[PDB]
């Protein structure tokens, strides 16, 4: 039950509870795993995402 | 409402347990259908299966 130390927390389960069972929901679950590292900020920002 | 009893006329009050019990002039059928569409959009069932 150690939520605070898990990787995937409450927003993920709340999202997958309601989301329609289609391809884009899978893709956006994948996009929800983009990291919060500063190097990831450089890489995402240079991609203009 | 007013009601009859054994040699008596009495007043009766009871609760409207569900919202559907409101008179249709005060909450009509099209309104209930639209409110249902609202709840369905809330649960992401906007186009239902």
From Swiss-Prot, chain B:
Signal peptide span: none
Q: Where is this chain's protein located in or outside the cell?
A: Virion; Host nucleus
Q: From what superkingdom does this record's organism come?
A: Viruses
Q: How does it assemble?
A: Homomultimer. Makes the hexons and eleven out of twelve pentons. Interacts with triplex proteins 1/TRX1 and 2/TRX2; adjacent capsomers are linked together in groups of three by triplexes, heterotrimeric complexes composed of one molecule of TRX1 and two molecules of TRX2. Interacts with scaffold protein; this interaction allows efficient MCP transport to the host nucleus. Interacts with capsid vertex component 2/CVC2. Interacts with the small capsomere-interacting protein/SCP.
Q: Which family does it belong to?
A: Belongs to the herpesviridae major capsid protein family.
Q: What does this protein do?
A: Self-assembles to form an icosahedral capsid with a T=16 symmetry, about 200 nm in diameter, and consisting of 150 hexons and 12 pentons (total of 162 capsomers). Hexons form the edges and faces of the capsid and are each composed of six MCP molecules. In contrast, one penton is found at each of the 12 vertices. Eleven of the pentons are MCP pentamers, while the last vertex is occupied by the portal complex.
Q: Would you tell me the protein name for this molecule?
A: Major capsid protein
Q: Source species, please?
A: Human cytomegalovirus (strain AD169) (HHV-5)
The record lists the lineage as: Viruses, Duplodnaviria, Heunggongvirae, Peploviricota, Herviviricetes
């Amino acid at each position: 039950a150690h939520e605070y130390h898990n990787w995937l927390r409450s927003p993920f389960s709340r999202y997958s509870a309601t989301c329609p069972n289609v391809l884009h929901s899978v893709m956006t679950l994948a996009a929800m795993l983009y990291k919060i590292s500063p190097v990831s900020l450089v890489l995402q920002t240079k991609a203009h995402i | 409402t007013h009601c009859q009893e054994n040699s008596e006329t009495v007043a009766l009050c009871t609760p409207r347990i569900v919202i559907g019990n409101l008179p249709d002039g005060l909450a009509p059928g099209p309104f209930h259908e639209l409110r249902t569409w609202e709840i369905m959009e809330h649960m992401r069932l906007r186009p239902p299966p």
